[PDB]
Design a protein around this nucleic acid. Structure first.
Ligand code: ATP
Ligand code: MG
Length: 519
RNA sequence: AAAAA
């Protein structure tokens, strides 16, 4: 049993004391809501039934539009595969379902963003929709029967996709567009990770703990330059390979030690990187300057191997490492009977730890869908601002928080919209925004539900200075950069973007939870 | 072609 590219660090098995801490770890995971209910799971499976119905109808309808016979259009098939954390079996109650739609050659992504998009919109169950056709991997994001779904589409080079099709055959990848290869590899990567760990259930528990920890410590969000689900999965998988007989609790301790001691940017790799024909691009820092720039590379096992942490910046690297060091101290303390699992999973203090914050607000006076598009675009560029800021001589760190803050306002007139852009983002002025603000208290209320809305999504970057530092160049670049995608958001009567420098004590109330109090 | 699954 060779798992991975080296032998194990240790084949020593778990002691009674370690197994006791493993039992306690699992109980803390349960208490903290790591595992969804049976009903919640049933709800996911029901969505998957509908998505398959839609996928096949999608392929049939496209086929017919391309003048194929009734019988041939049916034979074209189409199917779905899960991928991501639900397929891996480490999802929680709040996790999305990642769904890959596999379609034959005559069905393209333009079809996906027109016909399949159309089919989703017919559904009474559709709560939200935000198509993102221009992304490294194009996606339709939806909320369906209250469940977040991520939908991507891979076009195979064959006339038919039978329901029985599997993705094991590497021949299926021949000559495929880069975007489709990435799509198919969502599913293939999950399956290979499970193949590459000595004890899948030890791996699953350890990963559930790392997902909870990373969420709590605010080091989980691919979009903002932190590792996402697959990067965290592969990191845990590597530790599992190195300690094949350890319990999950011990894997956590070793995870923090090994990854804090790791000689970054040496890559984390789960299996020898497969060579392909010269037509196919594989992660290789010797050939590609871009790959050489990856700060903490975590490489997917599925051919062709890619880096799952391209978005990591100098600042987010420093934060991840700080958190690993904390993990070492706390897990050691847990194993020496001084601390609890609860201590490890304690919430971050992002909004207490810096003197200064840069506040980024995307405004939309329009539909919820328009706001999802605009705010999604802006959110996707925040890491670019982080990178521009962190290279400025006077900046010690530019630390992005991992989730936007959403709010909406009743906004009957053009003048009201201009007022909202004035008063928001400062605790000094934020009380004046009410009572236009929508709350879970009065949202049911006919006047509130019926009113035109202005929507806000606000992101924060924590700032620490090497010292006033002039930050106008990165900020102005960012403002202008977002505007040009392309002319879709140039209308200032509907879309706006504002950046605000804010000191810690003037941070909005939204930022602090019930248990917490303003500095 | 500034890597939103
Ligand atoms: N940056 C990336 N590099 C490589 N593959 C990725 C990347 N981001 C997403 N994926 C693929 O898409 C899948 C789903 O992405 P998603 O962001 O939903 O993460 P996940 O693993 O499902 O975890 P969770 O949804 O619980 O946060 C991943 O598991 C992975 O296979
Ligand atoms: Mg997911």
């Amino acid at each position: 049993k060779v798992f991975g590219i080296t032998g194990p660090v240790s084949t020593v098995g778990a002691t009674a004391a370690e197994n006791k801490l493993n039992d306690s770890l699992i109980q803390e995971l349960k208490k903290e809501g790591s595992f969804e209910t049976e009903q919640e799971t049933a709800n996911r499976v029901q969505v998957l039934k509908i998505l398959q119905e839609l996928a096949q109808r999608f392929v049939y309808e496209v086929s017919k539009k391309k003048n194929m016979s009734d019988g041939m259009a049916r034979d074209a098939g189409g199917k779905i595969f899960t991928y991501g954390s639900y397929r891996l079996g480490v999802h929680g109650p709040g996790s999305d379902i990642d769904t890959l739609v596999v379609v034959p050659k005559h069905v393209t992504r333009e079809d996906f963003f027109t016909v399949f998009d159309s089919l989703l919109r017919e559904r009474k169950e559709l709560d939200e929709i935000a198509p993102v056709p221009d992304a490294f991997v194009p996606i339709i994001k939806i909320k369906f029967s209250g469940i977040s779904i991520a939908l991507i589409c891979a076009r195979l080079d064959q006339p038919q996709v039978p329901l029985s099709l599997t993705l094991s055959d590497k021949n299926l990848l021949r000559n495929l567009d880069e975007k489709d290869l990435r799509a198919l590899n969502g599913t293939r990567v999950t399956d290979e990770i499970l193949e590459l760990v000595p004890k899948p259930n030890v791996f699953r528990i350890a990963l559930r703990a790392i997902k909870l920890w990373a969420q709590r410590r605010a080091v989980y969000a691919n979009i903002f330059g932190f590792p996402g689900g697959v990067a965290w999965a592969m990191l845990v998988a590597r530790i599992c390979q190195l300690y094949p007989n350890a319990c999950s609790a011990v894997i956590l301790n070793r995870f923090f030690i090994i990854l804090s001691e790791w000689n970054w940017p040496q890559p984390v790799i789960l299996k020898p990187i497969e060579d392909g024909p010269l037509q196919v691009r594989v992660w290789n820092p010797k050939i590609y300057a871009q790959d050489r720039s990856h700060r903490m590379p975590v490489i997917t096992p599925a051919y062709p191997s890619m880096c799952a942490t391209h978005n990591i910046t100098e600042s987010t690297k420093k934060v991840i490492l700080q958190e690993f060091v904390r993990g070492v101290q706390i897990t050691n303390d847990i194993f020496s009977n001084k601390k609890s699992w609860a201590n490890l999973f304690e919430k971050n203090d992002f909004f207490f730890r810096y003197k200064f914050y840069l506040e980024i607000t995307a405004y939309t006076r329009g539909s919820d869908e328009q706001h999802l598009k605009w705010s999604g675009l802006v959110e996707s560029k925040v890491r670019l601002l982080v990178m521009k800021l962190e290279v400025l001589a006077g900046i010690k760190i530019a630390h992005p928080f991992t989730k936007p803050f959403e709010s909406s306002y009743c906004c009957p007139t053009e003048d009201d919209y201009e007022m909202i852009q004035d008063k928001y983002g400062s605790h000094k002025t934020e009380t004046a925004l009410n009572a236009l603000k929508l709350v879970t208290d009065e949202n049911e209320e006919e006047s509130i539900k019926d009113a035109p809305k202005a929507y806000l999504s606000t992101m924060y970057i924590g700032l620490d200075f090497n010292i006033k530092v002039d930050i106008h160049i990165p900020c102005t670049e960012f403002v202008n950069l977002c505007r040009s995608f392309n002319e879709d958001y140039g209308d200032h009567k509907v879309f706006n973007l504002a950046l605000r420098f804010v000191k810690g004590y003037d941070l909005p109330d939204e930022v602090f939870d019930e248990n917490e109090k303003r500095p």
